[model samples]
Target chain A: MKTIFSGIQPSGVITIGNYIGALRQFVELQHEYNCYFCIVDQHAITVWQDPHELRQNIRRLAALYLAVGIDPTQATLFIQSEVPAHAQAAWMLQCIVYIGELERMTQFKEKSAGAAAAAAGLLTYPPLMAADILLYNTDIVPVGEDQKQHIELTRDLAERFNKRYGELFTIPEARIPKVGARIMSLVDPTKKMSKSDPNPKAYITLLDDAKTIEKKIKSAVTDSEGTIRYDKEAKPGISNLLNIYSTLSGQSIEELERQYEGKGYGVFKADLAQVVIETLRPIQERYHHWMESEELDRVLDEGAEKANRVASEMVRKMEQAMGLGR
Target chain B: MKTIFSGIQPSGVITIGNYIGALRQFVELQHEYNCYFCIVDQHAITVWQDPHELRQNIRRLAALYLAVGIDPTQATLFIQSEVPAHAQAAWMLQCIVYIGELERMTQFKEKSAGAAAAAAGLLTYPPLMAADILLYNTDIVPVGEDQKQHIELTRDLAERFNKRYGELFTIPEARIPKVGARIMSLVDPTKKMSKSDPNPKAYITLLDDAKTIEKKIKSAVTDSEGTIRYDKEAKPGISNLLNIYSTLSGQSIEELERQYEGKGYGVFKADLAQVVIETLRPIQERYHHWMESEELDRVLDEGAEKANRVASEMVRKMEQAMGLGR
Candidate 1:
């Protein structure tokens, strides 16, 4: 099976949009491909995070993975820092990544914008991200448009390393999908729905209560026009909600539009909110259960062990290739 | 006992100058302090290093440490890459170190000068160096003048981390000494004796045989002024030889000059060569013994385990302070 590696930052709450676009894809991809869902706590610290909050989020993220149907038996789900290879390999790749190239990264520039003193990690984490992917010999990295540049850099670094040293790494490709991945904000649909968004109503968090979820979806911004159709250019907010509903309910956008043809925004949003709540009910129950139970720790421990076995082997080879250790 | 940490790059052969200045100091300091002598193979890769030679040098450097009387029983002599904390903690510290600060580092600028593309590691490794020291709650770092900036950065980063987070790190002081550490090249007295130097006669390697050491010393540059007095400004070559002889033979420069009052440069060179050969003979024997024996690996493995225990604890604290893994 082709290997797929994805790192999720543990900075913010996992949004419902994240579940629909990414977590669902992870569950499906696990059966078809070897998948690694790394709770990228290491990457999250490039910016400041509260200690207790970060700790809670790490476990919460892992529990959310299992709650959303990511089988620990089929997929490896672990914390990034639990495996040391990520950092070790990152340092090696950092030697290959040039100062000029890292300076040119759009994400780094955007993140460091206006900051008088930005963390060096902000400028260099792509190498760490590259290490995460290359260490897995990953064939595919399922990433968003924003992460496409990082994936390309991963490919460039892999090629650069292979050419400079020997053929050691499997060059990975970015698996960017055209649709079903761009889940936008409910309050401002032009912008991607983010866990970091300041407004609680802007995005529906997976851990939000049923009432909160309903309230968020109802309050979602839309055009004054009452028609409920998928016209993204004219009506981004409604279109985003429609996309979420279609994806969660296992219906096409056209099918959804036809079903809600004569319905106003009121009925469509109500139905969509119900669809989201029902979809989240099972996941929320499972998440709370895992969070309280010892099962989550066991799964994470086992996943870390398995990942370590594979990653350590790659790191050993990399070390040998780079003349690091005896 | 205070804790002292030192990292030696494994890029080149261990020169006699390195032995006299750094390794010898480690041996002495171990009796009075908790010492960690790290063969910084990770740092060496900031510049290009041949994999095969790098591997060899890592072990060779470790062996030299043992050979030079750095008692493994008293001090931890380990490969940096062997212990995961170096890179892991380094990544955490990288998040604290700023891009502007790293850019302003003198070593980074000097090393990257005139290069089309400099490795990002060159710019980022100071944090790794900071991690190397701070991980151990290091009190003192024995460094040359060249490394004073890095030590200063380490202290600043440590203090910055403590101020921003909590009081998790001990701010380490740079133990920069004035005398007995400056060993100039035999061929070019104006330059420091370096392993990376192209001329074989410029520096005596720890692994060099008696004949090679003798030949190198015999051909050492000196002024036509027959007197063997320590005139550093007027006669750099003679002064360099006198320094080496004084340090190795445990005699003052005045004593040596008086002893060689009526003698020419030939007699002095011959005596100095013998002193060096004798000093290295036992070290070479012990080095070969460790190189062939399994004891070396065992020592390194145990050193890594011990270092990991301490370093991992600090990393956890740093992680918690910065809101990382649980």
Candidate 2:
């Protein structure tokens, strides 16, 4: 099976948009690919994070993946800091990466644009991210549009290392989602839904209660005409809802539009809220159950061991290639 | 005993200047302090290195330390890349270090100046160097005047992490050498002797043959006044030779100047060459022995294990402080 790698930032509670846009598909990908789902705590610290909360979030992220049907037996899931190879290999790749190239990264530019004192990790994080993917010898890296450039850099680093060091790393491709990829914000359909959004009403978190989800859906921005049509240009709000509705319910947009023909905006909003509730209810229940059990810790411990086996061997090869040690 | 940490670059063969200026003192320090002699192959790669030469140089450096009487039993001698905690802790420190501060490093500026493509590691190397020192809970770091800034930055990073993360690191101080610190080149007494200097005859490598040492010394520059004196301003070349003779032979510079009174440059050059040959002969013999034996490997392996016990614990505390892992 082809290997797939994905890293999730354990900075905040993952949203329903993250689940639908990426995590949902990862659950299915386990059987078809050798998947490594990493909680990228190292990457999260490129910006400041509360120590206590960061520790809690790391565990929570692992639990969330397990709760969402990611079988520990089928997919390797672990925290990045728990595996030494991620940072070790990152240093090696940092040597191969050029300063000018890292400076050209748009993400670093955006993150450091107005910051008074941006962390150096903010500039060099792509090498660490590349290490995350390359250590797995990943054939595919499932990343969002925002992350595609980083994956491209990962491929470039892998190829550069391989060419210079005698074919050691496997170049990986960025696997963009075919459906439900860019789930827009409920408040502003023009922007992708982000966990860091300050307004709680702008997006629904995976842990949001059914009533809260309903309220957020009710307050979601919509045009005064309120026609249930999927015109992203003129009616972006309704179109975003339609996209979420189709993705969660597994109903074609045409079928949903037909079913909602002559339906009022209030009826469509209420039904879509119910659809979201049903989708997240079981996941939240499983998440709580996993959170309360020792099984999550056991799974993570085993995942770290399994990941170390693969990553450590790769680091050894890299070390030899670079003449680091005998 | 106060702990001392020093990282040696495995970029090239160490010269007599390195031996007299630093390595010889380290051998004496082994018994007085809890010393960590790290072969910083990781730092060496911040610039280009021939892979084969890098590997050889790492082994050669370890052997050189052993040959120079650094007892592995008393001091921890290991390759930097062998200890995973160094890189792991480096990533944590990098997050705490700022881009502006790293950019302000004069060494980075000098190294990267006029380079077509400088490695990102050149810019971020100080953080890794900081990790190298901090991971050992080092009290005193013996470095050159040029390296004082890096040690200062390491101290700043250590203090910053401790203040922000609950006193997790031991702030370290830089220890500057008092005598024989800057050995001058044989060809040009005005400049410090360096291993990377293009003219091989300007400096004697620790591995140089007796004839090579004799030739280099015989050709060394001296003032036309011929009469030997220890006046640094009027007779820099003679003063440099006197310093080296005093350090190696344990004779005072005044004694050396008196012994050479009225003797031409010929007698001083011949005797200095003999002193150098006598100083390096045993070390060269031991280095050759270690290179041919499995004992060197065992020493390095055990050293890594010993280093890991201390460094891994520090990394754990750092991770906890930063909320990287449970």
Candidate 3:
């Protein structure tokens, strides 16, 4: 099977939009391909992080993945720091990446006020990301538009190392379709749902209780006409609701529209909330179970062992080619 | 006994100036202090390095140290890349070091033409150096004036980490005397002898045979009315030779001057060359022996093992403080 390496940031709680759009999709991808899901703890500290919150977030992110039916036995799931090869390979790539290229990264420019104000790691983190992908000999890195540039750089670094230092690294693909159910902000139908949004009702966190989920759905903005037809251009609010309803209930948008025919916004909001509530109930239950037990640690320990085997071999070859040690 | 750490660069073959000035002094220090002489292979590649030459230099550096009587059984002598803690701790320190501070490094400014033209590793290598020293809990770092700023930065990073993330790192001493014999260039006696000198006879390589050493010393510059007295102001060339003779042959300048009383430059130059030739004969022989045999590999392997234990613990605390991997 082809290898799929996905680096997950261990930030705070992810919204349901993240669940439907990426995490859930990865659960399915794990069954079809050899998957490595790494909680990139090292990357999170490029900017300062609260130690207590960061530890909690790391565990919570892992538990969420396990609860979402990502089989730990089949897919390697681990923390980035646990695998030494990531750091080792990253040092090698940093030697090759130029300061100009790192400075030109749009993310770096936008995030920092100026170059002098930024952390040194902020400039070099792209190589760290490249090491994350290239270490596994990954085939495709499924990510959003924001990270497409980093993936492109990863391809370049892999190619550079392969050609200059013998054929060592597998050049990963630059593009991979982020195919998943599109979920947008409840408040603004045009913008994708983000936890960073100022409006609390704009996103639905996976941890949101049934009552809170119901209230947010009822408060969701809709048009005056309130017809449940899926015309995305004309009625974006109604179309977004229909999309979420279809994803949660396993019905097509066409099927969802038919079921909601002649129904007002009130009835549609109530039913959609129930679909979401039922969908998240067991997942949250399992998530809490994993968090409370020592099971999460055991799975992560096993994952680090599996990840170390492959990544160590790749770094070994890279070190050999680059003449790092005898 | 205090722990002394010295990071040696495996950039090239060393001149006899380095032997007289630093390397030989370290060989004496190893017996008294807990010494860690790390061949910093990771630091060597901050700029582009020839892979073939780098490997040769790494081995030659280790061999040179062993042949000079820095016992591997007493002191730790290992390649930096062989231990994972150096890279691991470097990543953590990189997160904390601001781009502004790294940009302010004198060495960084000197080596790099401009930020855009330099490697990203160039901006961040001070943190790597800090990691190298801090990982060992070094009490005194025996480095030249060129590295004093880096040593100071190491102290700052260690203090910052200790105060912010709990008391984890040892506060290394700010200054240490480079107690060794000072040697100057044979051609230009006013300047210190360096391998990078344009004149081939300016410095003597440790690998130089008796014939080459004799030719270089005989070609050394001196005043017209040369008196073999320690007159550094009036006669820099003869005074430099007397310094070399005093260090190598363990003879006082007074004793040497009395012995060479009324003697011409020819006799003194011949005697000085003989002292250098006999001194390097055993060192060069042992150096070649280490190069050809597997004994060098075994020493490095054992050194890596010993180094791994202490460095791993320090990095473990650093990682735990930073909330890296669970």
Candidate 4:
């Protein structure tokens, strides 16, 4: 089977937006592809991650990956640092690419615009990501809408190198997980739920307690009329609530709206909170089990070792192509 | 003793320029410093390099290092790719550095200018070189005039990282070698001898036979008004010959002028050619022996293992800083 590669940096706790946009789909993707999912510890420090939190976040992400059903038996789940070849090939690929090409990366510019310590990692981050995908000879890479550009660059590098030297790397395609894709903010439906949002009530985290989830929905913005109708243009708060409820329960917005056709938002919000809390109860229970156990540590260790093996072979091949290993 | 790191790419046969400028000095420094000399095969391929020739060049370099008295017992000499941690630490440093800083590198700009394919490696090559030196906590880095900037950058990164992360890496100073530092071209006295030069007579390779050396020197360019004077401005050609003689024999230019005060250009040129041949004869003989023997491979293997120990430790520390592992 053709392999698929994907990575999640432990930059922040996974938000509901993260779940809906990516992780939720990955749970099902395990059965379809020879997936290689990574907790990319290497990529997290591109912008100087805090040390203590970074370690904890990596563990949390590993637990979440398992909680979300990325079975280790079916998928190669791992941390990026364990694979030395990722960095090794990254160095070789860094040289293979031009300075202007790295300079022209739009994301690099956007990330470093106002930052004082605009790191080198921020600029060449794409090449390392390219190394991650290309090293595995990945057939597909599951990326968010935002990360599609980076993946496209990876495909280009792979194609260019293969053409120049010989057919070596598999040109991977970007696959944006479509189902439950967009989870907007409860306070501001106009904006996608993001970890960077200052409002804690903007999004529910998967591991957040039931009381916190209830309180967030209670504080969620609604119109003066307080009508429960899911009107995205006129009443975004109700529309966002409908969206989150449907994604959690797998019930359509039309079905939820019909059940509460003439109800006020208080009634709909109350029922929606129960649905959200109950739906997450099992996941939270599993998350607790993962947190308490040392199983994640073992899995990460095994996964990193497995990733190192796969990536090292490709690194050797690429290095050999560039006449590196003599 | 504090470690000293030095590296050379195995791209072409060593020119006489390389002998005085780096290798010969490296031989002396080995006695003073705990030297770790590297054949940076990975770094060499930032541009195109033929595989067969690259491997041969590395072998030739190792043999030359041994022949020139880089005592295997004192200096650790090895190939770079043999150590995985070199790449691992390089990736970490890559994330730590800024793109603007790499863009500002004059060497990357000058070398890759108008090249057919500007590889990514050309830009990020310094970080790997930094990693190479920092991996060993090197206190001194022997570099040529062209490499002074890279060493300075290495020191900058090392200090910047240490300041943020607590004391870790040693700030390495550049060690410019004295003897055989600048062997001028036979065809053009103003230019240093280089393998890339199109003219065969322009440079004397370590492997060049006595007859070829004598023939090239006899055909060397000189002004029609050639006086055996050490005047760089008016008599650049004869001055170049005198400079080579002084550099080889450890005599000053004034002493050389007085030693041959009444001597003609013919006598000085012939004597310089003989000295060049004698200096190279034993080195070439020893090179052939080491190239054919298993001792070169054994030394390299041991050296790789030794360097890997130091490199892996640095990678681990970096991994800890980024919270990549427990």
Candidate 5:
């Protein structure tokens, strides 16, 4: 079976846009591939994070993985910091890459200036991200569109290592998870719904209660016409609503259009809220159960051990390849 | 006992100058303190290195330490790459430090421009150096004068992390080893004897055979005026040789000067060669014995495990302090 790698930041509550775009797609990958779902807490601290909240977030993210139907038995779920090879391998990769290329990264160029003084980890974590993939001999990397460039850089690093050191790393491919629909912000229809967005109404978190989901949907921006339609260009808000409803209900846009024919924005918005709530209900319940029980810790322990066995061996090979140790 | 941490680069054969200046001093430290002698292979690769030569150099350096009388039972001796926490703790420390400080390092500032393109590791290895010290809760750092700046940086990073996260690391103090005599180059008495010097006759390696040692010392730079007296300003070449003999033969400079009062450069040089050879004879014998026997590998295995037990626990504490792991 092919190996797949994915790393998620444990920053905050993942929004519905993340659920539809990333988590749901990963659940389907476990059947055919040996998957690794990493909670990248090391990557999270490139900026400051509160100790208490970060600890809670690490566990919450792990439980969230289990809750979203990622089979623990089939896929390895662990923290990036828990696996030592990620950092070890990252150091070796850092040596292979030049400072100028790290400076050239679009993410670094854009984000570093906003903070004015960037942490060294912010410039260097790409290799840590790369190490997370190369350690597993991953064949495919399942990441969001924003992470696609990092996958390319990973391939380049793998090739560079193989050519310069030895044929050690298996070059991995960038795999964009197939999105059923491009989920958009509730407040600003033109933008993708992000967890970091300033306005709370612009996003619906996986743990958001039904009432909050309902209110966010009702207040979602719409055109003056307010007629039920799926015109993405002119009626972006209503079209975004239709996309969410169609994806969750497994109804085509054409079918949903006919079903809600002649309905005003009020009825259309009301029905969409139920679709969003029901979709999250089972996941939220399982998430809570996993969070409350001791099984979550058990899964993480086993996951870390499993990852350690494989990654440690790769680290040995990497060391041997570079003549790092006996 | 207070802990002491020192990192050595396994780049090439350690010169006799190094043996006197560093290795011999470290051997004395084993009895008084809990010393950690790390062959920092990870730091060696900040510049390009041949993999095969590096592996041999690592083993050679380890045996050399034992040969110089570093009791493996009292002091921990290991390769940095073999212990995972060095890299793991390094990642955490890297995140705490800013890029500006790393760029501001005199070593990096001076060397990076010469290379024209520096490895990311070149700029970041100071934190790795800091990790090596902090992992063991080191109270004293034994390094050369050239490395004192990095020790200060390590102290700053420790303080910064303690203030920002919590009180975790023991702030370490830098101790420049007391040199009985600062060894100078054989070809040029104006400069310190360096292994990387362009002329082979400029320095003698610990592994040099009797003939090589004799030849180098015989051709050592001296004043045209025939004199056996030590005059640092007037005859730096003769003064440097007098100091080397004084240090190795356990004779004071005054005693050596009186004994060689009527002698020419030839006889004095020959006597100095015998002193150096007799001092190194037992060391050379033991170094070869350890190199050929399986005991070298055994020592390394035990040393890495011993270092691992302490460092892994420290990593856990560090993670808890920073909220990196569950």
Candidate 6:
């Protein structure tokens, strides 16, 4: 089976959009492909993340992985820091990349614009991302809409190295998921759901309780003319709720609309919350159960061990090639 | 004692110019300062060094450090790749640095100019150099004229971090050596002796055998007049030889000129080769002895251990400050 690698930064809580777009897709891919899932703890510090919260976020992401059916036995799940090869390979690629090319990275421009313009992490961060992909010899990489540029960089590095060093890296392609990845903010339906959203109703956090989820959904923005429809621009709030409902209930958007035909906004909102609460009930139960036990730590320990082994071998072979004294 | 930091890349053979200019100075400084001498293997890979060659360079550098009197017992001499904190701190600093500033590095410009412009290692390599100096909380950085810019970058990073995070790093100043530090070329008196010089005859290698040393010194460049005078501009050849003679013999330039005032080129050149040979004899003896025994490995292993302890503690605390992994 062709191996696929993907990672998420454990800098914050996982949102519904993240679940629908990435993690949910990951669970399905694990059974079919050789999947290696990493919680990129190292990448999180590229921006100044609060440390205590970061640890919480790392465990939360791992637990969410398990709670959402990413069996550790099937998928090699781990933290990026647990492996040294990522940095080692990255150092190698960093030596190969040009400063002018790194300057051309669009994310560096967007992330470093305005008051945060002086930040160094935002500038040279893409090299580390390239290392993360290239070190795994990753055959496939899944990226969100915003992360496509980073994946493109990864592909370019792989190609550059292969051309120079000869077939060492498997050039990976970006795999965008085909489902409910685009959940917008509850309070502001036009904006994608973000951890930085100030409004509590803007997103559904994995750890958020059913009552909170229901309340947030109730207050979600909708047009005054509330006949359920799937127009993203015109009825973003209702469309988002419909998308989330269809995702959780395993029903199509048209089927949901047909079921809720002639229904008022109140009835539709209540049904949507039911679908979300029921959908998340098992995951929330597992999240708490895993949180209380040492299961998360065990998964991480195993992950660290597996990741270190793979990364160590890659780095060791690289060192051997460079005639570096071990 | 205040901490002093020095970086030696594992890229090439240790030349006499390297010995007298940088490493030898570090050896003397070890007695006065708490030193962190790094075989900056991580930084070495910035230019696509062969893996095996890189490791050999690291061992060679470590061995040379001991042969030249950098007591491993006194200094924390270690390979940079062995310690993860260097790269970790670098990742954090990478976010804080601007793309414009990284592009402004002079070394980056020169390294990226030609046939070797294959990688980013040549581009953003300086920031990691900054990370290496600042990571040890270094108080004094011994740098040559060419390397002063890197030390400046280190100070800037220290200033940047301190401004954001309340006194995390020590602002270091450059410590310039006054004597026995400027050694010129053997083949071309005009150019400085360098490892990168294509002609092997241009510099005296610490690893060279007695015969090769004599041969290199015998073929040394001289002006058409061939007068044995210490005129730096008008007679650069004799002056270069005189500089080496004074440096190794511990005699002043004036004293050397006075002693050889009426001597011809043959007497000066012959005595100078003998002086060069005599200076390297004991160092070569120590190097071969250590190479034969387990001393080099033990010294570097202990060095890595000592460095890891210091670097790990700094990294752990830095992680605490950065809110990493909580």
Report the lDDT tens digits of candidate 3 across residue range A89-109. 899899888877888998888
Better of 3 and 6 by DockQ: 3
Cα displacement (angstroms), candidate 4, residue B182, comes to 4.4
Specify the poorest-scoring 10-residue window by lDDT in model 6 chain A: A111-120
DockQ of each: 0.81, 0.82, 0.74, 0.62, 0.82, 0.52
Task: Rank candidates by DockQ, best first.
Answer: 2, 5, 1, 3, 4, 6
RMSD of each: 2.7, 2.1, 1.7, 2.8, 1.4, 3.8
Clashing pairs in 5: none
How many clashes show up per model? Answer: 0, 0, 0, 16, 0, 31
Candidate 6 ranges beyond 4 A from true positions: A28-34, A72-76, A179-202, A207-212, A219-241, A251-258, A292-295, B17-29, B109-118, B166-168, B186-202, B207-239, B250-262, B292-295
Give per-model TM-scores: 0.92, 0.95, 0.97, 0.92, 0.98, 0.86
Model 6: DockQ score: 0.52
lDDT of 1 by residue, B101-160 (tens): 898999888978878998999899999989999999989888877889888998998898
Model 4 residue B150 lDDT?
94
Model 3 clashing residue pairs (backbone): none
Cα lDDT of model 1 by residue, A1-326, tens digit: 89998887775378887787767777787999999989988888888777788888899888877888999999999998899999999999999899888999999889788877888889999999999999989898988777898888989999999998899999999887547558898888898888878888889888888899889999999898888888878988888888888888889998988998888988988998899889889989998999999988899899899998999999999988888888
Would you list the clashing residue pairs of candidate 1? none
Local accuracy of candidate 2 as per-residue lDDT tens digits, B272-291: 99999999999999999999
Q: Candidate 4: TM-score?
A: 0.92
Measured with C-alpha atoms, the lDDT of residue A81 in candidate 2 is 84
Model 3 chain B poorest 10 in a row by lDDT: B173-182
For residues B1-326, could you state the per-residue lDDT of candidate 4 as single tens digits?
76778787785477887776777777877888798988988888777777678877888888887887789888899899999888888877877777767878999788667776577787788888899899998887877788899998989888888887777888998977664346678898888788889999998888889999999888877787745777766776787787777878888988888888777778888899999999999988998899899988899988898889888888788788767766
- Candidate 3 ranges with C-alpha deviation above 4 Å: A114-116, A176-180, B114-116, B174-181
Query: How well is each residue in A14-123 modelled by candidate 4, as lDDT tens digits?
Result: 88777777787777777887899877888888776778988888778888778877798878888888778787777767766776677778887787677766778888
Candidate 2 lDDT over A1-326, as tens digits, reads 89998888885488888888778888888999999989988998988899999999888888888888999999999888888999999999999999988999999898888879999999999899999999988999887777788888988998999888899788999888866447889999898898989888889988899989999999888887767888888898998999899989989899999998988789999999999999899989999999999988999999999999999999999988887888
Alpha-carbon lDDT, every model:
0.87, 0.89, 0.87, 0.81, 0.89, 0.78
Output the lDDT of residue B153, model 4. Answer: 90
Candidate 3 residue A98 Cα shift, in angstroms, is 0.3
